[PDB]
Structures are given as C-alpha cells and as structure tokens.
Amino acid sequence: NQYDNDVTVWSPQGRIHQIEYAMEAVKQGSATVGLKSKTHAVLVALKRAQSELAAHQKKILHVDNHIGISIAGLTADARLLCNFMRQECLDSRFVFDRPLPVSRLVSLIGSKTQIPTQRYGRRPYGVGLLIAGYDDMGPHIFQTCPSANYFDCRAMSIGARSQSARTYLERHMSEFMECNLNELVKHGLRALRETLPAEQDLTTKNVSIGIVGKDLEFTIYDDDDVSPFLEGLEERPQ
C-alpha cells in the first residue's frame, strides 16, 4: 500500500514489493520454452509483431559459440545483459583460451542484478532469461529472474501463458533425455503451442529455434529454416 515506491524499503511482513512488481514484467513478454536432452539443448520462442506489416521481434540472441539466450520482459535490460555476457565470454577466451562455463556466467549475472535490489537510484532488471549452453559438463538450461535469483532446470517456460507449456513439460520430462534432436524440438514446439489460443497455431513467421550441442555451435533458425521442424506436428483438434 505504502511500502512500494522504493526498492530499499522492507515491509512489516518482510517483503520488497518493487522486486515482486519487476517479476510481473516477465509476464508481459511473449512465451519462450527451453529444454535439454543429454546431448543437445533447445530454445524455441514465439515471436510477436507490433504492426501486421512489420517484421517480428527477435527473441533469441547469440552470446558465444556455446551459449545463447531467449528473453521475456523489457527489451532494454535484455540488450544490456547480452552485451554484458558477450564481453564476459570474450574476457574468458582472451585470458584462458577456453569457453566460459554457463554456471559461472549466470552466477555473474546474478551478482550484477543484485545491486539494483539493494541500492537506490537504479531500477531492477525487468527481464527474465532462459539460457541454453554446452560445456565440459554437458547441456544446461538456466532460468534467470528479476529477483537476482537463478535456477538450474531440466526444462522451463516463461512469459505470458507459460503455465500451459510448463504443465506439458512436467509430464514429458521422462522422455527428453534419450530423445534425438527432432523429437526434442517437437516437444518444445508442442509445449509452445499449448500457450496459444485454439484459434492460432505455429507458423514460419512467429517461431524461432535455437540449438547447441557437442558437434553444433549455437545456430538460430528463424523463418524458412524452421519448416523442417514444423513438419511432423499432429494437427491438433480442440
């Protein structure tokens, strides 16, 4: 009611409401899904256009040859954090001539985003990320939150209407491990489809896919490179 206009203020119940409100900005972006097998990690997004006669907003970003992100929230925070990640990875290749692990990148991201939660005169980062990568420990899927917290995940969906995708993924986790790439991408696409209305469906225009693995750098498939992955989806009735 009146412990809300600042992030340096606790409430009598032990809560900071500006952080809880920044977490509500992830629910305003379009839905993204992330999932991993034992060999590959996949991100599929659903892109959104402002005007019908324009291009769709880009949802997946390249960070290095072994890490990539999909974003839901404010665009500016995502563009700042991506440029942070890229330089933190270049700084690791310069010194050690090795790729930076993903745990050590998301730890840095959390350490970075923790400051606006505690010092006044700066806004909390109102962006959530799903981070797919591959290092010497296998594939990884990481969620990052405006609360400066981060999780290691088997799969996750964030954004508007993402509970449907989460419910889908929660009952197919037992298959993702021994799935090949086609089946894994198809599970991702079906979980994403569960976030749409019954009117709409997936299309070349509004679907982007990001894949990384042992013998595969982080590639992005946007418009016509997606149509191999769509062919195979059962035409669901309602």
Binding site: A25, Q28, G29, S30, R48, Q50, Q57, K59, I71, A72, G73, L74, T75, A76, A78
Partner: protein, 207 residues
Amino acid sequence: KRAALIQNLRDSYTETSSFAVIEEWAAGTLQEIEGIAKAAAEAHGVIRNSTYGRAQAEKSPEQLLGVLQRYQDLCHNVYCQAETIRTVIAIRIPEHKEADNLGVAVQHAVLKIIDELEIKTLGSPIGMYALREYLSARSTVEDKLLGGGSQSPSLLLELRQIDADFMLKVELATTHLSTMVRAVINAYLLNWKKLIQPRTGNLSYYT
C-alpha cells in the same frame, strides 16, 4: 459463459444509444424547455394582472396544471434518457487497479454530472413532483377560506401568491435545466472515446 454475459450486456447498450440521446437533447428537448418557460411566463403575467375572491377558491385554473404536467412529463423523459448514458458508461468500468485510471476518472467525472442532473436537479428550485406540492398547499388555503370562512385578507392574497410562485419556479427550473443539459452534451461529446475504451495496451516496450 461469463464473457458471453459481458458482451451480450454491452452490445445491448452501445455508443449509438447515447449519441441518439445527445442528438434528441440538442434538437427538441431544449425547445420544449423553452416552450414551458414561455407558457409559465404567460400564466405568471396572467395571474399578476388579476384580483382574487372567493370564486377562485372554488376551482383551480386549467392553465397552471397544464404547465406543471408538461414539466413533469419533461423531467420523466430526461431522467429516463440520462439513465441510458449512465448504463452505457457503467457497464464499461474496467477491472479495479491501483494504476492506469485516467479514463476511469473521465467516467466518474461524467457520471457526476449525470448525477447532478437526474437525481437532484429534477427533484426525483422545483422538481417533477411539483403538481402535488401545488395542490396540497392550495387545498390547505381553500379549506380555510371556504370552511367557517376565514375573513383574513392575507390568506386570499396568499392564494394568489401560491398560484404565481409555482409558475415562477417552473420558469427558473427550465432555465437551470437547459444549462445543465447543454453542459452534459459537451461533457459527452468531448470525452466519448475514453468513456467507452478507457484503457489501451499497445505495449511495444516488451519482448
């Protein structure tokens, strides 16, 4: 289901159902308001230029009851028309929030003008139920003048003053009502866009 109820309720009361009211008010209601004030001034000038006796207490004029009934019929229609606009705005109040309430303020601002009109300015100086207020007083004076017949002259003058003050009251109330209707017309025509769709969420700064 629920959205079915909301849309079946909103399509029954549309922006056209309020613009038609505004049109009729701008066109004919104001001329009727003028014609009632005209006739009230005529009857007032008639009552002034006359002297009263016992014969006036034995029957009421056909001239003033007509004016009062016409004012009553006016105010009934104005109330029933204002409530249409009231419904059109009230079935479009969006869900409660602590923010994004700049169109809700417009809604609650025009509903206050409609509240100042209908519940109060029509009496739902004088209101619709003025004919009974005239008849009760004139009966109180008549039963004292007729009976023992009271020989007080100020009573017989108070009869004549009751018959004139009510015409004066209607003449004033018609002017005030024309003012308020002309205010409501502007208030609707300058704000009808946020009275209908008060919230717009083309949110471009989110990915």
